[PDB]
Amino acid sequence: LILIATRRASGDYRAAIARHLALAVTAAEHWRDENACRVVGVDLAGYEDEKTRAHYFREEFTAVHRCGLAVTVHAGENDD
Amino acid sequence: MLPELPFADLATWSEGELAWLREPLDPRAPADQRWVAGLPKIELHCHLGGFATHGELLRRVRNAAENPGKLPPLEEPRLPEGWPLPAQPIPLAEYMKLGNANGTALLRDPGCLREQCRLLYRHLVDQGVCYAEVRCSPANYAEVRSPWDVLADIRAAFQECMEGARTAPGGLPACHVNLILIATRRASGDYRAAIARHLALAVTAAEHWRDENACRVVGVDLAGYEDEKTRAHYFREEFTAVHRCGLAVTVHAGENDDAEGIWRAVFDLNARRLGHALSLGQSRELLRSVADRGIGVELCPYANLQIKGFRLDGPGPYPLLDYLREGVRVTVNTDNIGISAASLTDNLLLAARLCPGLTRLDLLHLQRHALETAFCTATQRLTLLRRISSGIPRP
Amino acid sequence: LPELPFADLATWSEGELAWLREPLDPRAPADQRWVAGLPKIELHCHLGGFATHGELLRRVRNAAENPGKLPPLEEPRLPEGWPLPAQPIPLAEYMKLGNANGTALLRDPGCLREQCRLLYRHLVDQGVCYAEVRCSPANYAEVRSPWDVLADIRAAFQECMEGARTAPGGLPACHVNLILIATRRASGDYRAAIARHLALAVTAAEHWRDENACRVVGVDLAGYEDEKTRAHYFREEFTAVHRCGLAVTVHAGENDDAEGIWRAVFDLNARRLGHALSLGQSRELLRSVADRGIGVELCPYANLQIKGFRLDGPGPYPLLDYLREGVRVTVNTDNIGISAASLTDNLLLAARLCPGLTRLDLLHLQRHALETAFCTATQRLTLLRRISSGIPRP
């Protein structure tokens, strides 16, 4: 399994995405059975806000990477 | 005729016992001791790993392990000479060592873990406390089951205790206990990962249990004194995530004071309830801000007496009265019942002795300050206020 | 019978409490006389919007110290039925209204002295016990320094309470404080104004350090939307100011939604919010605010005049909803002159914005101001004893 960021901004990114990250790392730590379905990573999706993006960026990356979960990234409408 | 009082005199009492609250509380004779025991007290600083540390209490939990003999044998680390109210302060590291019998080593099997928190509720209801926030570290208990498994086990056990004793006035709720996840302690070479794992565990748990009135995790308390001292230099981003979702940060200072760090801890981390912030007089402006902006200062007199001398009845004097005089909302708590070998009722009675001058009415303020500093929804806090607005015995 | 906010309320007999738990008719003459004597306290004023028409303006207009350049008397024509207007008016028109004073005649040092001292006498006969009038010295300064303006503003209040407030215990008249409100868009970069505004406030708080005298406490960081991001961009500055003893408030006002509330409550550590009549629709955000204890400032007449709420049955006024969950929300008047309504008018009107407002709710709404006021701990207890003197019955 892999968990995706929630749309329909409510709490914008901080409230919506932190729970998504917190759910993943808790679930990844819940099932260590290598021969069983378990959470293996996340993606970021929801992005493109004001200059506070880096603060959200530096927060989202740090927590997951310290744990060591895999990270994917989706590309929005514009693929600059 | 009546003064302001904490909660409007609970629809008044007679002139006879108005003066009774005025005189200082001397912890002598049954009359004084019996009254506090009947109070509906409230604590906010209690560790689950600091219970049943010695005596028969240890025996009951030890023999209730689901796997009968797997755990290390019986041993009770001897308490120092007159350990309740000792004559010589001891370092914190040794004090933490008095609980090797009951803790990480013992609470490994759900059979004993359920039992350990089984009689905590019995002890709390026996103490007359209505609202408590037992601290726990599920990360310390992880061999085959997840840390989430342990936390779910603890929550279910309290509900079993909470539903078994579904009594007392109101909606018959008896005593309500919440959970505060206290760090990871064991930093086996990877501390930043552990604190990241721990913080996100609460966020998932808090969202998992959003029910109206039942046991649920209400906040975290990072004890950041990391390998590089200040961990908030990197933990500022992590603390922001958990703070936005909900929960309450109740960082406890404890070691080495560092009022300069407290400034950094109180504001940047947006802490809501400081811990053993014993020394604040030398930082006059810091105390005023904490006095003005509502931030609780949890206190544990027995633990402070066991860690610091304080020379009760002739470090300086105990700052509880001074903190109360200035107006900062401070609370009396228990820390570890088993390690300190003292109940909460002992804590309050001993609190007066540490500072000659605590009137019989100040303890009401201590219970008052506990209510506002409690991590609970406002709807239930009013009900807690109503319970406090009664159930207190007129002498 | 059960617990209730103040202490002397429980002293009342059961007959009074029957009059307590019932909805108050604003049109009832007995009710109007009741709240008039009620020792209420208010938070959200604007000083500059004190006098706008009538004898109040002429009182300060002729009180100038050198009238050779005072602008003429083009008193703006207020809309028909201006208290309870026909339909909502834009904020820009609202601010434009009352242009007669502000940066028109307060620039005169003598004229400003009358304007502020006249406001104080408008308070004592209004029953207000404690006030936190908000001033913008940078606006009222062309040749003299802004610090001089704040020096005169503080001194005039002090002298207006040096003798009037004998302070023999229970009668220090009405004790007032000052909140440095951010100045509007001056001709130039607003970043310098914001920096100077905070710099002016910080040194002011440490210049009048006593408690009995009027002192500067508080500063807001709200204005427009480009400046709203600018303040968030320079959020490191807000860290310094509120560590010096200056509690920061935020005037959410327009386009507050959730981000503005989220930013204010956490990034800037705001201890009180301005017009924030949108907390209800986000549910969880309102739940978060209630637990934190952040105060909410709601001034009904301004909220009715600009937003429009069709009182006596834009959605419903959130007053009962706010008091239900428990967010500490208070009543205010915004600026007295523009709304042309005193405190007592606002209190009574709040009862008819929406069906409800029992007397306990009105006292609870009164108490939240005491809880979220920027006074010190000793001052707060002094108020609480003093506030516990409300009119019990006819």
Count of CB atoms situated within 10 Å of the CB of C308: 14
Q: What is the 3-state secondary structure (H, E, C) of C275-316?
A: CCCCCHHHCHHHHHHHHHCCEEEECHHHHHHHHCCCCCCCCC
Q: Under an 8 Å CB criterion, which residues of C touch B?
A: 1-11, 239, 242-243, 245, 247, 262, 266, 269, 271, 284, 287-288, 290-293, 325-326, 376-378, 380-381, 384-385, 388
C-alpha B131/C-alpha B180 separation (Å) is: 13
C-alpha B315/C-alpha B295 separation (Å) is: 24
Q: What is the 3-state secondary structure (H, E, C) of C362-394?
A: HHHHHHHHHHHCCCCHHHHHHHHHHHCCCCCCC
- In sequence order, the 6+-apart residues with CB closer than 8 A to the CB of B321 are B355, B357, B358, B362
Q: Which residue in B192, B203, B241 is closest to A59 by CB distance?
A: B241
- In sequence order, the 6+-apart residues with CB closer than 8 A to the CB of C135 are C46, C47, C48, C150, C153, C178, C179, C180, C181
CB distance C9–B7 less than 8 Å?
A: no
DSSP 8-state secondary structure symbol assigned to residue B313 = T
Residue A11 distance to chain C (closest CA, Å): 7
Distance of CA C150 to the CA centre of its chain: 18
C-alpha B301/C-alpha B295 separation (Å) is: 19
C-alpha B20/C-alpha B16 separation (Å) is: 7
Structure tokens at A47: 């992005």
CB distance C11–B5 less than 8 Å?
A: no
C-alpha C301/C-alpha C346 separation (Å) is: 6
C-alpha A22/C-alpha A11 separation (Å) is: 15
User: Looking at chain A, which runs of residues are DSSP E strands?
Assistant: 2-3, 41-43, 70-72
- Do residues C357 and C371 touch, judged by C-beta distance below 8 A? no
Structure tokens at B78: 């001897």
* Residue given tokens 């407290």 in the structure block: B262
Residue C158 to residues B94, B363, C50, C117, C380, Cα–Cα distance (Å):
58, 39, 18, 9, 19
Nearest residue to C360 (alpha-carbon basis) of C318, C323, C311, C317: C323
- Do residues B102 and B52 touch, judged by C-beta distance below 8 A? yes
CB distance B4–C384 less than 8 Å?
A: yes
- In sequence order, the 6+-apart residues with CB closer than 8 A to the CB of C47 are C115, C116, C119, C133, C134, C135, C153, C335
Residue C389 to residues C5, C37, C42, C345, Cα–Cα distance (Å):
13, 10, 17, 20
Q: Under an 8 Å CB criterion, which residues of B touch A?
A: 146-149, 192-193, 196-197, 199-201, 203-205, 207, 234, 237-238, 240-242, 244-245
Q: How many CA atoms lie within 13 A of A40 on its CB side?
A: 8
- In sequence order, the 6+-apart residues with CB closer than 8 A to the CB of C382 are none
C-alpha B203/C-alpha A19 separation (Å) is: 6
C-alpha C296/C-alpha C276 separation (Å) is: 7
The amino acid at residue C289 is: V
Contacts of range B376-385, beta carbons closer than 8 Å, 24 or more positions apart: B376/B131, B376/B178, B376/B218, B377/C287, B377/C290, B377/C291, B378/C290, B378/C291, B378/C325, B378/C326, B379/C325, B379/C326, B380/B176, B380/B213, B381/C326, B382/C326, B383/B170, B384/B42, B384/B130, B384/B131, B385/B7, B385/C3
Q: Which residue in A19, A31, A59 is closest to B238 by CB distance?
A: A59
- Do residues A11 and C190 touch, judged by C-beta distance below 8 A? no
Structure tokens at C255: 């386009």
Which residues in C lie closer than 8 A to residue B263 (C-beta atoms)? 243
Q: What is the DSSP string of C202-264?
A: HHHHTTS--SSS--EEEEE---SSHHHHHHHHTHHHHHHHHTTT--EEE---TT-TTHHHHII
User: Looking at C88-163, which runs of residues are DSSP E strands?
Assistant: 130-131, 134-135
Order of strands, edge to edge, in the sheet holding B46-47?
Answer: B46-47, B131-136, B176-181, B217-220, B248-249
Nearest residue to B219 (alpha-carbon basis) of B159, B147, B140, B273: B273
C-alpha B148/C-alpha C64 separation (Å) is: 73
- Do residues C275 and C251 touch, judged by C-beta distance below 8 A? yes
Residue B330: beta bridge partners? B297
Q: What is the 3-state secondary structure (H, E, C) of B219-257?
A: EECCCCCECCECCHHHHHHHHHHHHHHCCEECCCCCCCC
- Do residues C304 and C349 touch, judged by C-beta distance below 8 A? yes
Please tell me which residue of chain C has the smallest CA distance to B329: C377
* Residue given tokens 């001056």 in the structure block: C186
Q: What is the DSSP string of C53-98?
A: SHHHHHHHHTT-SS-SS--------PPTT-SS-SS---HHHHHHTT
- Do residues B224 and B231 touch, judged by C-beta distance below 8 A? yes
C-alpha B179/C-alpha C31 separation (Å) is: 47
Order of strands, edge to edge, in the sheet holding A41-43?
Answer: A2-3, A41-43, A70-72
- Do residues C12 and B12 touch, judged by C-beta distance below 8 A? no
Residue B314 to residues B91, B249, B310, B356, C206, Cα–Cα distance (Å):
22, 36, 9, 10, 38
C-alpha C216/C-alpha C208 separation (Å) is: 7
Which residues in C lie closer than 8 A to residue B267 (C-beta atoms)? 239, 242-243, 269
C-alpha C179/C-alpha C136 separation (Å) is: 8
Please tell me which residue of chain A has the smallest CA distance to B206: A19
Q: How many CA atoms lie within 13 A of B141 on its CB side?
A: 27
CB distance A18–B203 less than 8 Å?
A: yes
Nearest residue to C291 (alpha-carbon basis) of B326, B4, B337, B272: B272
Structure tokens at B162: 């909470």
- Do residues B251 and B222 touch, judged by C-beta distance below 8 A? yes
Nearest 5°: phi and psi at A15? -70, -40
**Which of C12, C243, C246 has the most B C-beta neighbours within 10 Å, making it the best mutation to test the interface with B?**
C243
Residue A14 distance to chain B (closest CA, Å): 6
- Do residues C304 and C351 touch, judged by C-beta distance below 8 A? no
Which residues in B lie closer than 8 A to residue C388 (C-beta atoms)? 4
Q: Which residue in C229, C233, C259 is closest to A12 by CB distance?
A: C259
CB distance B267–C7 less than 8 Å?
A: no
* Residue given tokens 């959020």 in the structure block: C235
C-alpha C9/C-alpha C2 separation (Å) is: 11
Q: Which residue in B149, B203, B237 is closest to A19 by CB distance?
A: B203
Residue B132: beta bridge partners? B177
Which residues in B lie closer than 8 A to residue C247 (C-beta atoms)? 292-293
Please tell me which residue of chain C has the smallest CA distance to A52: C233
Nearest residue to B53 (alpha-carbon basis) of B348, B338, B267: B338
Please tell me which residue of chain A has the smallest CA distance to C286: A11
Q: Which residue in B244, B291, B386 is closest to C266 by CB distance?
A: B244
Structure tokens at C238: 């807000």
C-alpha B265/C-alpha B271 separation (Å) is: 7
The DSSP element (H or E) to which A56 belongs, if any, is: helix A53-67
Residue A49 to residues A5, A79, B213, C229, Cα–Cα distance (Å):
15, 16, 37, 12
Q: Which residue in B197, B238, B245 is closest to A29 by CB distance?
A: B197
C-alpha C241/C-alpha C270 separation (Å) is: 11
The amino acid at residue B173 is: P
CB distance A26–B238 less than 8 Å?
A: no
Helices C146-162 and C109-124: crossing angle in degrees, nearest 10, is 40
Q: Check the annotation: does B100 bind a ligand.
A: no
Structure tokens at B73: 């044998």
**Which of C262, C278, C281 has the most A C-beta neighbours within 10 Å, making it the best mutation to test the interface with A?**
C262
Q: Give ∠ CA B108-B114-B117 in degrees, rounded to 5.
A: 105
- In sequence order, the 6+-apart residues with CB closer than 8 A to the CB of C186 are C138, C193
Helices B344-354 and B362-373: crossing angle in degrees, nearest 10, is 120
- Do residues B232 and B269 touch, judged by C-beta distance below 8 A? yes
B254: left (phi over 0), alpha (psi -120 to 50) or beta: left
DSSP 8-state secondary structure symbol assigned to residue B296 = E
Q: Which residue in B148, B193, B237 is closest to A59 by CB distance?
A: B237
C-alpha C350/C-alpha C362 separation (Å) is: 9
| Contacts of C among chains (3+ CB pairs under 8 A) | A, B
Which residue numbers come right before each break in chain C (C to N over 2.5 Å)? 313
Q: Give ∠ CA B247-B253-B254 in degrees, rounded to 5.
A: 130
Structure tokens at A4: 């995706």
Nearest residue to C9 (alpha-carbon basis) of C360, C394, C362, C344: C360
Helices C377-387 and C359-372: crossing angle in degrees, nearest 10, is 160
Nearest 5°: phi and psi at B36? -65, -35
Please tell me which residue of chain B has the smallest CA distance to A14: B241
C-alpha B123/C-alpha B112 separation (Å) is: 17
A45: left (phi over 0), alpha (psi -120 to 50) or beta: left
**What does R_g of chain B's alpha carbons equal in angstroms?**
20
Structure tokens at B244: 């936005």
Please tell me which residue of chain B has the smallest CA distance to C13: B11
Please tell me which residue of chain C has the smallest CA distance to B294: C293
Structure tokens at A76: 């929005």
The DSSP element (H or E) to which B46 belongs, if any, is: strand B46-47
DSSP 8-state secondary structure symbol assigned to residue C163 = S
Residue B60 distance to chain A (closest CA, Å): 30
Residue A27: Cβ-neighbour burial (10 angstroms; 0-12, 13-18, 19+): middle
Q: Under an 8 Å CB criterion, which residues of A touch B?
A: 11, 14-15, 18-19, 21-23, 25-27, 29-32, 55, 58-59, 62-63, 66-68
Residue C272: Cβ-neighbour burial (10 angstroms; 0-12, 13-18, 19+): buried
C-alpha B53/C-alpha B50 separation (Å) is: 6
- In sequence order, the 6+-apart residues with CB closer than 8 A to the CB of B290 are B266, B274, B277, B280, B297, B328
C-alpha C383/C-alpha B106 separation (Å) is: 54
C-alpha B181/C-alpha C216 separation (Å) is: 40
Residue B199 to residues A57, B213, B221, C109, C235, Cα–Cα distance (Å):
18, 23, 9, 57, 25
Tell me, in Å, the resolution of the deposited structure.
Answer: 3.2
CB distance B196–A62 less than 8 Å?
A: yes
Q: Check the annotation: does C140 bind a ligand.
A: yes
Which residues in A lie closer than 8 A to residue C229 (C-beta atoms)? 50
Nearest residue to B270 (alpha-carbon basis) of B234, B298, B236: B236
- In sequence order, the 6+-apart residues with CB closer than 8 A to the CB of C256 are C275, C276, C278
Nearest 5°: phi and psi at C379? -65, -40
Which residues in C lie closer than 8 A to residue A8 (C-beta atoms)? none
Count of CB atoms situated within 10 Å of the CB of B150: 23
- Do residues B124 and B177 touch, judged by C-beta distance below 8 A? yes
**What is the four-CA torsion angle of C357, C361, C367, C372, rounded to 10 degrees?**
-70
